[PDB]
Subunit: 256 residues, 2 copies
């Protein structure tokens, strides 16, 4: 198991972030062929834990069987194409747990995030016991830094260093943007503290695989938040009510 | 590398088989979500080898990127979602070679098949050099034998032991069907000699993985041919001209 916390400072409010994030998941995924087909919802209900954490809990299986060719669709070991996702939505706290039926208890990706109106200055925001916290590498992702982007991933249109919002005037984000965020007129700020736990038990590969998955999550968080900012004009005016209407709307396209 | 030859005796003619096979690939796959989307054709042209083998050669990449969720679509190692398929169509001889960009030269599934008007009595129909032929396990698949089917795979409607063709009168196939095939009035026969070469280099798993893939191919060949027979009334009257028209027709639905 490998734990790291990715701290993503952003020139948006905690309230705006909830909307932008949900919008961006959709628009970044407009791409997908069978988008949301083959998704079985096992559970979807309110919850409250003994510790007071409360929100909406879902449990879903993404069945990948029909989205791959038969020759590959066969071949897979039993359960390898059934990915489970458990999610606890308690915004501004969120948790997701991804597992796979074939891997059983040998594989897990857990992401627990606090969205806070600060500049990433909180140490142990997830309140880990002191010994566990000592094993967590803290990593800051800077959405304006070109050196944090893989050349193959780069797109001028998704580069915060080049984008200025028509609706808000935010951006472009220059090298000292974070240092001027706090006192800058009209710019809100927040930090997503994404604590990521990766387990991939195997044999002579565990360390290499857990580190590789972490690198892929870092990459994803970097690209995703660069996009989220550059799509500011598309979502800034949307409310959560709009987001809900939109999902039910796509859900109705379950006319299949 | 592991080589085995699967000999599939069938109550159809070599000529009928070409049509049934192509039809069944489609109908068994009607299922798939994005069916034939994301398929890049690199090459498609006539060929002739120095040894006289001649036909049509294609080289395709099945890009799986957009058919899986972003969170999985990310995660994959570079090239893991690009599957190459090379096919040589020289019916009644056929060859397919499947590889993967991430695995590079460490993974291969090659299937070479002769379709012959006989009862599987030819030894070394693929003309392997004697030493290589000695390492090939020959395996007969009997489409009427319930014991060769996995319980989870079983379907009464795809069981040759229960099906009788309305258009031809063939079937149902009882325990001694193969022994009466030759002298039975109005029943044609053939055998598909499918020589399957599997390479999966890895470390402490090569033997286990190559044997597992072979088991999956055997399973696929068993299910597929049970289906092909039970779908006899759907395709027996189709010609290859019909098949061609049908593919171009689905191809035109590249209106995307």
């Amino acid at each position: 198991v490998l734990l790291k916390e990715y701290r993503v400072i952003l020139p948006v409010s905690v309230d705006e972030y909830q909307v932008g994030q949900l919008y961006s998941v959709a628009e970044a995924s407009k791409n997908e062929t069978g988008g949301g087909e083959g998704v079985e919802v096992l559970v979807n209900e309110p919850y409250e834990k003994d510790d007071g954490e409360k929100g909406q809990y879902t449990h879903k299986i993404y069945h990948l069987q029909s989205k791959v060719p038969t020759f590959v669709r066969m071949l897979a070991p039993e359960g390898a194409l059934n990915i489970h996702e458990k999610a606890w939505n308690a915004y501004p706290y969120c948790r997701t747990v991804i597992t796979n039926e074939y891997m059983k208890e040998d594989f897990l990706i857990k992401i627990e995030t606090w969205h806070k109106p600060d500049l990433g200055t909180q140490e142990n925001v997830h309140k880990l016991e002191p010994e566990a916290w000592k094993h967590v590498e803290a990593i800051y992702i800077d959405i304006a830094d070109r050196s944090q982007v893989l050349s193959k991933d780069y797109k001028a249109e998704e580069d915060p260093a080049k984008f200025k919002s028509v609706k808000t005037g935010r951006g472009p984000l220059g090298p000292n943007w974070k240092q001027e965020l706090v006192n800058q007129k009209d710019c809100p700020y927040m930090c997503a503290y994404k604590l990521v736990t990766v387990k991939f038990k195997w044999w002579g590969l565990q360390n290499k695989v857990e580190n590789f998955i972490h690198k892929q999550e870092k990459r994803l968080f970097t690209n995703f938040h660069r996009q989220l900012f550059c799509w500011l004009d598309k979502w800034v005016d949307l409310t959560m009510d709009d987001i809900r209407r939109m999902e039910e709307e796509t859900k109705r396209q379950l006319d299949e």
